[PDB]
Design a protein around this ligand. Structure first.
Ligand SMILES: O=c1[nH]cnc2c1c(-c1ccc(Br)cc1)cn2-c1ccccc1
Ligand SMILES: O=c1[nH]cnc2c1c(-c1ccc(Br)cc1)cn2-c1ccccc1
Ligand SMILES: O=P(O)(O)OC[C@H]1O[C@](O)(CO)[C@@H](O)[C@@H]1O
Ligand SMILES: O=P(O)(O)OC[C@H]1O[C@](O)(CO)[C@@H](O)[C@@H]1O
Lengths: 442, 442
């Protein structure tokens, strides 16, 4: 009794499955519909996209269903705010059809495509629309969680229109002034029928978060589960303040020169040159304040030492653990462990080294790093190749499949600037030679 | 340049400190005063104690300053609610003196004792008292974070009085009915001057959390930093619903028989007998629903397999990593690594195994396990000796120094029942022999 086998890729102990003559599969917890609530230019799409990026990265399949994109597909060219008028009988029918078509795709995503979270990105400003979404959720056995963004600051509204609305495909033939004016009129079309969430009386039984004044204040009502609690925590940690994230690896180490993986080797002569070059680079950036984070491995600490700035060591930033393959070259891995080598090449994200880690394990370890990176402003993270690929996949919205192959060369700073609905990435090579540790797929 | 040395105990790379002829120390971020707000029997002491237990366990030095305890010290015997009357000039002076004496001890704790968080556990129901606490915080460069508990449910109030108030040292000479009646009158003394937190107008600039109806709803205003954000997340995950936490180790394994540490060995014949005994025990508990958690190591999975219940594997529950000492006996550790053996014996909590972990690393890894244990109801955790000691230290409020020496024998279930201001612990030995893996300090 109690016979188990270790799965070759992930190294998970599973019951020995001696399937009977006729093997039967029991093909395939409740999915969630996240309902965005609020007037236009309230950062609903910003929240939708960012939350989806985070949820997918942590391993929760998430997709955004933006009703405006269904509208741009149904209606060829956008002319003006007149399309959004409450007295526009025809466009009101079209807009309802678009919302229903998005919900149809929500049902298909959650019940038939293995999706766990569907973010329904629309105004959903009326109780009637929200009652209809709730009916849709109850009949399909989906959970409903509401995220309302409330902001009456005209500076914030104008900034949102200028940053991401005027550049919308709707305003292609318009200049900045025309687009801004049309969008203000477009917002006014929604103001009369807007019924904010009322957790006090009407929406008392709804699971919701009210994000007030760009995350200055929050009203949290009836958090049912783990995922809603995580979302709430995330929303409370993110901000829209201007800042820069610099990501780089430690300067070239002795193991890099020998083509050895893992270990805790020190900087090579070139690595020490990069460390000095990094200090000059950091100085030239002229940042008011800068937080410096390293791993607990020698090579990242030695690199930070050259900066003459306070730094914090995170064990979570330590390179992927190669288990039995630690301190070995890739040639020695292929010759001593050929089965292990081939398994990794075939499934680089999920593959776990014996007594070691997978890129999947890295994500779990790096979750607190990401949450702290969100809270902070100017940060420099001095880490390792696999750790850097994971962090970069989060910021650049790269899939689990792409993640183990992202290019993160030595002696190169990745400058991340948050703009619109993501990150602008600039690469800065600090003109110090090193070996190449990048290996493409086969 | 960039010369580092690895600290012998914690294995941290530090700059080689060639102190000059006259070595100088720069002896020794801003501390926080957590201000409890609310009427009596609102669970302020419950929140204070639980939050302090969690903060200390994660490594943030925290202490509770309960004004009522300063009062019990200043005033010999408690007679009645008449002491709390607003017209009681003398007792009002005494109560103010007690609050000021507690604040004096708050200043000494945060500025002179290396404390990071002081939980000021009092009613602090008036704006005047809170303005005075804010003045105290501003003048001492301490941050202020308010936690208000609002509940007008008479069932909840009566339950709190029955569970922990009637048993208070104040009601020693009273019977349950007298104590309940006196306490209701005592609450009424505070109702007239009670000014709840107003984040809308008056308390707009204050950093606060309003816990409404025993955590059903929350009002969160101006979360300034990491620690406040963590507190908010914690408060949103905990609950007062009745439940049981069962903690045990995997059944005896092959490494246990050989006296070997770490590894991924399978259950011995006795271990398999425990697994069957555990199933019978679980069945006899007759729990409506039960979540079963294991590590990713074979021995805990084989134990769970015997239960015929769904289970979830957590990599965070994997035994402490012994690095280079993995799969070795303690005798082989003492003979091959005598310096390492002695270092661990001297500092068992902070000691890190080479390329391995410390009990301190375990706490960081187990933080998400604790947060999920808080969210859940009936849970059975099948884990390992060091992991179990860490979890138990959290539930039993044991220090970092005590933690590596907590007794967690094999084939023994630790039944945890949340009651009053902590956990009731029952031990259930399942009558299956095993080796002893406990080692006392030297
Ligand atoms: O509350 C808003 N109102 C208007 N605009 C907004 C927001 C937020 C926002 C909302 C909640 C949280 Br938690 C964090 C950010 C982001 N944005 C935004 C910023 C830049 C570009 C595009 C949109
Ligand atoms: O809000 C309350 N009002 C009255 N009593 C209460 C509470 C809470 C409480 C409050 C906030 C959160 Br988040 C979790 C629990 C706990 N207690 C309590 C329960 C058992 C014994 C002693 C006290
Ligand atoms: O996933 P890959 O391509 O092996 O990259 C991660 C490896 O690269 C290194 O950073 C050095 O090449 C090793 O420390 C680590 O094992
Ligand atoms: O901290 P201690 O007393 O060495 O206990 C933890 C050790 O005990 C074991 O659980 C077995 O005795 C090992 O797996 C682990 O290294």
């Amino acid at each position: 009794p109690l016979e188990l086998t270790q799965s070759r890729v992930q190294k998970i102990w599973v019951p020995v499955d001696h399937r009977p003559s006729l093997p039967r599969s029991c093909g395939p917890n409740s999915p969630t519909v996240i309902v965005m609530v609020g007037l236009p230019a309230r950062g609903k799409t910003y929240i939708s996209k960012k939350l989806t990026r985070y949820l997918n990265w942590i391993g929760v399949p998430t997709k955004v269903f933006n009703v405006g994109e269904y509208r741009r597909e149904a209606v060829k060219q956008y002319s003006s705010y007149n399309f959004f008028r409450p007295d526009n009988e025809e466009a009101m029918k079209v807009r309802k059809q678009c919302a229903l078509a998005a919900l149809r795709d929500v049902k298909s995503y959650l019940a038939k495509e293995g999706g766990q979270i569907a973010v329904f990105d629309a105004t959903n400003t009326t109780r009637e629309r929200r009652h209809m979404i709730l009916h849709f959720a109850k009949e399909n056995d989906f959970k409903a969680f509401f995220i309302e963004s409330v902001c009456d600051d005209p500076t914030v509204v104008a900034s949102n229109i200028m940053e991401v609305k005027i550049s919308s495909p709707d305003y292609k033939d318009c200049n900045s002034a025309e687009a801004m004016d049309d969008f203000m009129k477009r917002i006014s079309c929604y103001e009369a029928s807007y019924q904010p969430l009322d957790p006090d009386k009407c929406d008392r039984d709804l699971s919701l978060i009210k994000v007030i004044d760009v995350g200055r204040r929050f009203l949290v009502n009836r958090v049912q589960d783990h995922i809603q609690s995580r979302i709430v925590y995330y929303l409370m940690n993110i901000h829209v303040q201007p800042r820069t994230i610099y990501l780089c690896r430690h300067g070239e180490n002795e193991h890099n020169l020998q083509g050895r993986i893992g270990g805790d080797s020190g900087l090579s002569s070139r690595g020490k040159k990069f460390a000095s070059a990094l200090s000059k680079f950091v100085e030239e950036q002229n940042l008011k304040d800068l937080r410096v984070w390293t791993s607990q491995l020698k090579s990242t600490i030695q690199t930070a030492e050259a900066l003459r700035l306070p730094y914090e060591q995170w064990k979570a930033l330590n390179e992927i653990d190669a288990g039995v393959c630690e301190e070995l070259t890739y040639e020695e891995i292929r010759d001593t462990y050929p089965e292990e080598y081939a398994l990794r090449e075939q499934d680089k994200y999920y593959y776990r080294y014996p007594t070691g880690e997978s890129y999947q394990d890295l994500v779990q370890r790096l979750e607190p790093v990401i949450m702290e990176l969100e809270r902070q402003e100017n940060v420099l993270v001095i880490c390792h190749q696999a750790v850097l690929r994971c962090l970069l996949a989060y910021f650049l919205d790269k899939s689990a499949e792409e993640m183990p192959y992202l290019k993160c060369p030595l002696h190169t700073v990745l400058k991340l600037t948050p703009v619109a609905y993501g990150c602008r990435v600039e690469s800065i090579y600090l003109n110090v030679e090193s070996v190449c540790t990048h290996r493409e797929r086969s």
